[PDB]
Amino acid sequence: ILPDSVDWREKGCVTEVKYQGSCGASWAFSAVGALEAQLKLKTGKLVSLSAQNLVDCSTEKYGNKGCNGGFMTTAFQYIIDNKGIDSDASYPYKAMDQKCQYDSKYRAATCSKYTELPYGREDVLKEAVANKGPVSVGVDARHPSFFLYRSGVYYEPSCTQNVNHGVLVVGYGDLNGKEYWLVKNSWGHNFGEEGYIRMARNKGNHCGIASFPSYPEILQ
Ligand SMILES: CCCn1nc(-c2ccc(C(F)(F)F)c(SCCN3CCCCC3)c2)c2c1CCN(C(=O)CC1CCN(C(=O)CN(C)C)CC1)C2
């Protein structure tokens, strides 16, 4: 028994679409995105968290290379190890690699744990999005059709399950029988449907959307 559609934006758990620019920081926006929702759930406060904090501070120890890419899971581990992440207000995004300037005075969130979901399992991802909240995922975005996407249910026959771009699954549903994942990107408001893309669901792990899902939690 799961709901047929969910959209975590309607629950006030999704901050504004961000704009990564020419820095490969999608992993960091995916990670803060997922944690922003858990922060809202636990505290009632909706606050954008610092993607730049992760870019600058969750580096070699975490297998991450700032503007040259990273992992959402090891970004979560950084936040756990660091005992904090700064607000985006305090530590705003510059689309470049900088020296780590974390200050605990401006800590806006904490992270207690994270969970990695099994590869390709869109049924388990559906359960997680319904029962836990927005889920950080990777997709195969190396396709002109992705960059040019305007509206509708995205399907790309040449998509692979090898991911290269981090995004956030904030919901799911179906548009007249065509099932989709509701995805928040970090390419600004002029990408897709006001910064969002609806990507084909239950179509064989399309564009690797369920290849590497993960989500953080903030425990009492
Ligand atoms: C072929 C599959 C490998 N892969 N790719 C992603 C994946 C997932 C999401 C994205 C995306 F798109 F969301 F960012 C991407 S893009 C390429 C990122 N890259 C980040 C390193 C720099 C180059 C760019 C890749 C993941 C995987 C394997 C499992 N994942 C994890 O996060 C867990 C790993 C455990 C072992 N690691 C360690 O670092 C162990 N210690 C040394 C710390 C790496 C992480 C997710």
What's the total number of domains in the chain? 1
**Which amino acid residue places its CA nearest to atom 23 of ligand 1?**
69
Domain that holds residue 208: 1-220
What CATH number did the domain enclosing 189 receive? 3.90.70.10
- CA–centroid distance, 77 to ligand 1, in Å, is 13
One-letter amino acid for residue 73 of the chain: T
- CA–centroid distance, 136 to ligand 1, in Å, is 12
In degrees, rounded to 5, the angle at the alpha carbon of residue 207 between the alpha carbons of residues 206 and 210 is 70
Choose among 34, 25, 198: nearest CA to 117: 34
For residue 171, the surrounding DSSP H or E stretch is strand 165-175
**Which amino acid residue places its CA nearest to atom 15 of ligand 1?**
164
What residues line ligand 1, using a CB cutoff of 6 Å? 26-27, 30, 62-63, 65, 69-74, 138, 163-166, 212
Which region holds residue 207: left if phi is over 0, alpha if psi is between -120 and 50, else beta? left
Burial 75-105 (b: 16+ CB within 10 A, else e): bbbbbbebebbbbbebbebeeeeeeeebeee
Model resolution, angstroms: 1.9
**Which amino acid residue places its CA nearest to atom 39 of ligand 1?**
63
- CA–centroid distance, 63 to ligand 1, in Å, is 8
Atom number, ligand 1, closest to the C-alpha of residue 138: 13
**Residue to probe by mutation, ligand 1, list 67, 71, 214, 215, most atoms within 8 Å of CB:** 71
- CA–centroid distance, 55 to ligand 1, in Å, is 15
How many CA atoms does the CB half-sphere of 163 hold within 13 Å?
23
**Which amino acid residue places its CA nearest to atom 29 of ligand 1?**
212
Chain gaps in the chain, named by the residue before each (C–N > 2.5 Å): none
- CA–centroid distance, 131 to ligand 1, in Å, is 25
Distance CA 186, CA 195 (A): 7
Which residues, including other chains, have CB under 8 Å from residue 67's CB and lie 6 or more apart? 23, 24, 25, 55, 95, 96, 97
- CA–centroid distance, 44 to ligand 1, in Å, is 31
How many CA atoms does the CB half-sphere of 200 hold within 13 Å?
17
Residue tagged 């999608």 (tokens)? 26
| Inter-residue contact 88 to 48 (CB < 8 Å) | yes
- CA–centroid distance, 73 to ligand 1, in Å, is 8
Distance CA 32, CA 16 (A): 12
**Which amino acid residue places its CA nearest to atom 21 of ligand 1?**
70
